[PDB]
Amino acid sequence: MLRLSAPGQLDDDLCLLGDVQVPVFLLRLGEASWALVEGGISRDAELVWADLCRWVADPSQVHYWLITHKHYDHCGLLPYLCPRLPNVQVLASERTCQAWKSESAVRVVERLNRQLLRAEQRLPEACAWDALPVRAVADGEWLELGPRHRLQVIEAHGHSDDHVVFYDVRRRRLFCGDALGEFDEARGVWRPLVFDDMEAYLESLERLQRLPTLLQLIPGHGGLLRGRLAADGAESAYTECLRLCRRLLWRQSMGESLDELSEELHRAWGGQSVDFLPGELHLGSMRRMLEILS
Ligand SMILES: C[As](C)(=O)[O-]
Numbered sequence: 001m002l003r004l005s006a007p008g009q010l011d012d013d014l015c016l017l018g019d020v021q022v023p024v025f026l027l028r029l030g031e032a033s034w035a036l037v038e039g040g041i042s043r044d045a046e047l048v049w050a051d052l053c054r055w056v057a058d059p060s061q062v063h064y065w066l067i068t069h070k071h072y073d074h075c076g077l078l079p080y081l082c083p084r085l086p087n088v089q090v091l092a093s094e095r096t097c098q099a100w101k102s103e104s105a106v107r108v109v110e111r112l113n114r115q116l117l118r119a120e121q122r123l124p125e126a127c128a129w130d131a132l133p134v135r136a137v138a139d140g141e142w143l144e145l146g147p148r149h150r151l152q153v154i155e156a157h158g159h160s161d162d163h164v165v166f167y168d169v170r171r172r173r174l175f176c177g178d179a180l181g182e183f184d185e186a187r188g189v190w191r192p193l194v195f196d197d198m199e200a201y202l203e204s205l206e207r208l209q210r211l212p213t214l215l216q217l218i219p220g221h222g223g224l225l226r227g228r229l230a231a232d233g234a235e236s237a238y239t240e241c242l243r244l245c246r247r248l249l250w251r252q253s254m255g256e257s258l259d260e261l262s263e264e265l266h267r268a269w270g271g272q273s274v275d276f277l278p279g280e281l282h283l284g285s286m287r288r289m290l291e292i293l294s
């Protein structure tokens with residue numbers, strides 16, 4: 001009752017498209033206007049598209065697509081659905097936009113997204129990554145998407161050096177991507193995802209704690225959190241990061257290698273993302289996190 005984990009309508013203005021493991025959120029801005037939030041994985045294009053069209057009879061009414069960060073599982077749908085969305089404008093940070101103009105970077109994103117295709121699956125036709133209708137948004141920028149939707153852009157680096165989150169001040173609703181970590185569905189706690197910069201990761205969570213009380217907290221994976229899970233989310237994510245650090249120091253101090261400890265974390269936590277993150281990459285991300293924290 002504190003996490004909404006079924007695709008479909010979540011609120012009067014808000015729907016979850018696709019699978020809850022890598023969801024795309026649909027906002028109704030008006031009678032003839034909509035926005036998407038989060039960019040998904042490429043293999044989900046036809047599923048997300050099918051869901052979309054059952055809510056939006058005219059896809060030319062999809063006007064904005066908000067993107068938290070450049071990781072392959074948060075922008076993989078863009079080249080494949082943007083062509084079907086003639087009036088969409090993609091909103092993303094400056095650093096996120098940069099990645100889509102680099103071929104070495106685009107090659108990685110496309111290669112990862114391809115590893116996720118189902119047996120015998122075919123991707124739609126992709127427009128050019130460097131032709132996406134992007135508009136760079138800045139830290140603190142107010143996005144007036146509609147008469148009842150004003151969302152603030154907030155820089156939230158640490159998980160990645162480009163990550164931003166989008167805060168609907170009216171609805172107390174935060175789209176937070178992976179900045180709080182991965183929500184542990186069985187245990188109800190955040191699993192830290194410190195893959196770039198520990199100091200920035202914690203600083204972002206400090207700032208996000210100072211927002212007005214959250215009523216809805218929407219990460220990049222797992223659905224919508226509400227009640228105390230939203231109100232306490234940023235603070236709990238901070239606590240869980242410090243906790244992992246303290247426990248890492250214990251385990252290392254007893255002689256456990258980063259090799260064994262990363263494999264242990266991989267076994268403990270890889271299960272939730274098995275269907276959208278190759279296990280070798282989850283393991284490597286665990287290893288990088290433990291290196292950063294150490
Ligand atoms: C692919 As990930 C662990 O940054 O959500």
Ligand SMILES: [Fe+3]
Pocket residue numbers: 069071159160178
């Ligand atoms: Fe990520």
Ligand SMILES: [Fe+3]
Pocket residue numbers: 071073074178220221
């Ligand atoms: Fe992610």
